Amino acid sequence: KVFGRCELAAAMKRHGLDNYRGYSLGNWVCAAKFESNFNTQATNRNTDGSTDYGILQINSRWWCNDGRTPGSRNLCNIPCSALLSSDITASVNCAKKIVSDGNGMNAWVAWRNRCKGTDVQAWIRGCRL
Numbered sequence: 001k002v003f004g005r006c007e008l009a010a011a012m013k014r015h016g017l018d019n020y021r022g023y024s025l026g027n028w029v030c031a032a033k034f035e036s037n038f039n040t041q042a043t044n045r046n047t048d049g050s051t052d053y054g055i056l057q058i059n060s061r062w063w064c065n066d067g068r069t070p071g072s073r074n075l076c077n078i079p080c081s082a083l084l085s086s087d088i089t090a091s092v093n094c095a096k097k098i099v100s101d102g103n104g105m106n107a108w109v110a111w112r113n114r115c116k117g118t119d120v121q122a123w124i125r126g127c128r129l
């Protein structure tokens, strides 16, 4: 599914991301925009053989199982395919684990390079929430 901006903001809020670990809703919307262009079915293969999955491009080296990332972990206890669903539950619940690790949203390189420090509230401007 390719979400609209406000559509995703509303879904993320329903799924409990607004102010999760202190990160306002616009941070999560910005991160999704630059990670996946709001497409739940996004995938990208990394040079190390791991793959990033879903609207927040969650990586198989640590967070999910895909059966083809040798030596990796599955800390969200899910198949990586669950991160591609129209239903954002698995992506949200896993992102909550990830952001609760020590580096916060810096885990998402696109957040650090494109969202951090910017007017992230603009991503939710105008949306019914």
Ligand code: NA
Pocket (backbone or CB within 6 Å): 060, 061, 062, 063, 064, 065, 066, 069, 072, 073, 074
């Ligand atoms: Na894995």
